[PDB]
Scaffold this active site. Structure first.
Site, PDB file in Angstrom:
ATOM      1  N   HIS A  83       0.865  -1.168   0.000  1.00  0.00           N
ATOM      2  CA  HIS A  83       0.000   0.000   0.000  1.00  0.00           C
ATOM      3  C   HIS A  83       0.908   1.226   0.000  1.00  0.00           C
ATOM      4  O   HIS A  83       2.128   1.113   0.092  1.00  0.00           O
ATOM      5  CB  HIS A  83      -1.061  -0.061   1.136  1.00  0.00           C
ATOM      6  N   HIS A  85       1.765   3.648   1.857  1.00  0.00           N
ATOM      7  CA  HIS A  85       2.265   4.324   3.042  1.00  0.00           C
ATOM      8  C   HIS A  85       3.780   4.230   3.132  1.00  0.00           C
ATOM      9  O   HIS A  85       4.425   3.400   2.499  1.00  0.00           O
ATOM     10  CB  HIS A  85       1.638   3.731   4.288  1.00  0.00           C
ATOM     11  N   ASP A  87       5.731   3.072   5.337  1.00  0.00           N
ATOM     12  CA  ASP A  87       6.294   1.807   5.791  1.00  0.00           C
ATOM     13  C   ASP A  87       6.260   0.746   4.713  1.00  0.00           C
ATOM     14  O   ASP A  87       6.722  -0.375   4.936  1.00  0.00           O
ATOM     15  CB  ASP A  87       5.579   1.317   7.077  1.00  0.00           C
ATOM     16  N   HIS A 148      -7.349  -1.170   5.862  1.00  0.00           N
ATOM     17  CA  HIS A 148      -6.439  -0.171   6.414  1.00  0.00           C
ATOM     18  C   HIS A 148      -6.230   0.963   5.437  1.00  0.00           C
ATOM     19  O   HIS A 148      -6.014   2.102   5.843  1.00  0.00           O
ATOM     20  CB  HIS A 148      -5.119  -0.837   6.768  1.00  0.00           C
ATOM     21  N   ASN A 179      -4.298   5.037  14.622  1.00  0.00           N
ATOM     22  CA  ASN A 179      -4.673   6.031  13.629  1.00  0.00           C
ATOM     23  C   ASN A 179      -4.998   5.300  12.337  1.00  0.00           C
ATOM     24  O   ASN A 179      -4.134   4.656  11.730  1.00  0.00           O
ATOM     25  CB  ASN A 179      -3.578   7.068  13.424  1.00  0.00           C
TER      26      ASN A 179
HETATM   27  C1  LIG Z   1       3.018   4.080  12.457  1.00  0.00           C
HETATM   28  C2  LIG Z   1       2.287   3.038  11.631  1.00  0.00           C
HETATM   29  C3  LIG Z   1       2.647   2.577  10.399  1.00  0.00           C
HETATM   30  N1  LIG Z   1       1.764   1.675  10.003  1.00  0.00           N
HETATM   31  C4  LIG Z   1       0.875   1.575  10.956  1.00  0.00           C
HETATM   32  C5  LIG Z   1      -0.304   0.610  10.841  1.00  0.00           C
HETATM   33  O1  LIG Z   1      -1.281   0.627  11.614  1.00  0.00           O
HETATM   34  O2  LIG Z   1      -0.291  -0.235   9.936  1.00  0.00           O
HETATM   35  N2  LIG Z   1       1.198   2.405  11.941  1.00  0.00           N
HETATM   36  C6  LIG Z   1       0.522   2.608  13.197  1.00  0.00           C
HETATM   37  C7  LIG Z   1       0.991   1.545  14.197  1.00  0.00           C
HETATM   38  C8  LIG Z   1       1.961   0.628  13.838  1.00  0.00           C
HETATM   39  C9  LIG Z   1       2.382  -0.342  14.729  1.00  0.00           C
HETATM   40  C10 LIG Z   1       1.836  -0.401  15.994  1.00  0.00           C
HETATM   41  C11 LIG Z   1       0.880   0.513  16.357  1.00  0.00           C
HETATM   42  C12 LIG Z   1       0.463   1.482  15.471  1.00  0.00           C
HETATM   43 ZN   LIG Z   2      -0.275   1.979   6.183  1.00  0.00          ZN
HETATM   44 ZN   LIG Z   3       1.714   0.143   8.747  1.00  0.00          ZN
END
Ligand SMILES: Cc1cnc(C(=O)O)n1Cc1ccccc1
Ligand SMILES: [Zn+2]
Ligand SMILES: [Zn+2]
Length: 231
Positions: A83, A85, A87, A148, A179
């Site tokens: 996706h 984002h 990460d 997500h 979030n």
């Molecule tokens: C900062 C980040 C990146 N991707 C996510 C997600 O929810 O996938 N998040 C939120 C997250 C990730 C891991 C643990 C808790 C929250």
């Molecule tokens: Zn994401």
């Molecule tokens: Zn993530």
């Protein structure tokens, strides 16, 4: 044992062999004053490697490739981002320079140019409709619907019964929905249903972040999600 966030400095990457020719890659990043772990996947394709998602940032993807070299010493030739984002595309520039062909769905590609994130070069055709599945070397790609994010993809490795579910799938230890602004809360659970029905034979389930479990991770994420929905 799995690498936990409390075991990986931001800037290092770990590989975890899951089967013959199937690794996961684990990394860490700081964000809003906290540290989180991130996963992605490595599948062996004869003599090449297929990389699923980046390692959350330029630096970590550089380490991710260097740890691939140290430990597998096979080349990464294709990369899929699951996706838009950071990460999952943070570090597409490092891969492309390294001569990796980077891929994403057009929806991912669009949303990434819009958010100002790094853009996979090639466009994965044939996944725009929920339920759509395409083959891609040693894995299957699946669009389960919005969740997500509207554009999030899951990857199954059939040889190894491995399901990479990405940020659409939560680890058990994670009980708050976080979030989820880019999410479709109303379709996310229907979307997980589709995952279950298309890969019931999955024995090893990997989330976007945290520890792997099995299909029970799907009931879990349905639950956490449905409990955010009802706040
Ligand atoms: C900062 C980040 C990146 N991707 C996510 C997600 O929810 O996938 N998040 C939120 C997250 C990730 C891991 C643990 C808790 C929250
Ligand atoms: Zn994401
Ligand atoms: Zn993530």
């Amino acid at each position: 044992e799995y690498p936990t966030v409390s075991e990986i400095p931001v800037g290092e990457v770990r590989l975890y062999q899951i089967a013959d020719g199937v690794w996961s890659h684990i990394a860490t990043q700081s964000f809003d004053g906290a540290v989180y772990p991130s996963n992605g996947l490595i599948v062996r394709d004869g003599d090449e490697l297929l990389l699923i998602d980046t390692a959350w940032g330029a630096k970590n993807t550089a380490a991710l490739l260097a740890e691939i070299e140290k430990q597998i010493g096979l080349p990464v030739t294709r990369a899929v981002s699951t996706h838009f984002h950071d990460d999952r595309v943070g570090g597409v520039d490092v891969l492309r320079a390294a001569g990796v062909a980077t891929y994403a769905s057009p929806s991912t590609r669009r949303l990434a140019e819009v958010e100002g994130n790094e853009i996979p070069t090639h466009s994965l055709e044939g996944l725009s409709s929920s339920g759509d599945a395409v083959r891609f070397g040693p894995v299957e790609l699946f669009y389960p619907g919005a969740a997500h994010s509207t554009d999030n993809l899951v990857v199954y490795v059939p040889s190894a019964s491995v399901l990479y579910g990405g940020c659409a799938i939560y680890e058990l230890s994670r009980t708050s929905a976080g979030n989820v602004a880019d999410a479709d809360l109303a379709e996310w659970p229907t979307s997980i249903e589709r995952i279950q029905q298309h890969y019931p034979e999955a024995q090893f389930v990997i989330p976007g972040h945290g520890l792997p479990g099995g299909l029970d991770l799907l009931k879990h994420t349905t639950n956490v999600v449905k409990a955010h929905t009802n706040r």
